[PDB]
């Protein structure tokens, strides 16, 4: 053959892979967490968006902390040999490093560890994408007028918001981040590399949304998502 280059993940396996969507809307009263209205809008948007990318989508609603862990464990134990990638979307309350099940917190690290290069061998060297719509703390952004690989390699964490900050959700339109993610995936998945798509998502969230509240503490606030990439190649959803 002629000259060959290898800067891009192999995305022409028989299957694109799984897209697990965990949608937590209703929380056990004892937790004191409020219902996440608008999140069903998000889950259906993601389901459609990733369906069109040829992912096998599994929607799961209102999972306990135990069910979340058990699901991820079971999924990480499937044979992913014929799949190009793995995607997991988490829609819930959160704080830094944490996502809530319906009855209490789950460490984000506990979830992603199931898919480490040494623990999920059929995903070794393949891109593992975690998309996280959840708070990462309580800060508000006021804005301004204008032969071995690492076991932690090949992960991408697409956070809805900066470390330490609230994440914003509209009870009618869905979360700012997931709204924007789906729009940019629909428009550019056949054209742009994933990092460049997520940058467009950053710009959309940063420029087109601003909170409206009767409460001055929460009014006129802004949001910037946060891409955390441990990927080792370029990721294109086409081939």
């Amino acid at each position: 053959s002629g000259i060959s280059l290898d800067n891009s993940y192999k995305m022409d396996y028989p299957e694109m892979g799984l897209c697990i969507i965990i949608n937590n809307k209703n929380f056990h009263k004892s937790t004191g967490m409020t219902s996440r209205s608008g999140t069903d809008v998000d889950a259906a948007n993601l389901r459609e968006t990733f369906r069109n990318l040829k992912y096998e989508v599994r929607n799961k609603n209102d999972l306990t902390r135990e069910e979340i862990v058990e699901l991820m464990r079971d999924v990480s134990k499937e044979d992913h040999s014929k799949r190009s990638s793995f995607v997991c979307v988490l829609l819930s309350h959160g704080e830094e490093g944490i996502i809530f099940g319906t009855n209490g917190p789950v460490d984000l690290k506990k979830i992603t560890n199931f898919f480490r290069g040494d623990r999920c061998r059929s995903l070794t060297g393949k891109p593992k994408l975690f998309i996280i719509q959840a708070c990462r703390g309580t800060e508000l952004d006021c804005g301004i007028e204008t032969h071995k690989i690492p076991v932690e390699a090949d992960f991408l964490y697409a956070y809805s918001t900066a470390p330490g900050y609230y994440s914003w959700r509209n009870s009618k339109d869905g979360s700012w981040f997931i709204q924007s993610l789906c729009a940019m995936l629909k428009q550019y998945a056949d054209k742009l590399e994933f990092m460049h798509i997520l940058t467009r998502v950053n710009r959309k969230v940063a420029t087109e949304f601003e909170s409206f509240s009767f409460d001055a503490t929460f009014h006129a606030k802004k949001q910037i998502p946060c891409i955390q990439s441990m990927l080792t190649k370029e990721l294109y959803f086409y081939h």
Binding site: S92, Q133, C135, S167, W168, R169, S211, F212, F218
Partner: peptide, 4 residues
């Protein structure tokens, strides 16, 4: 608009 609501926070999560």
């Amino acid at each position: 608009d609501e926070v999560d």
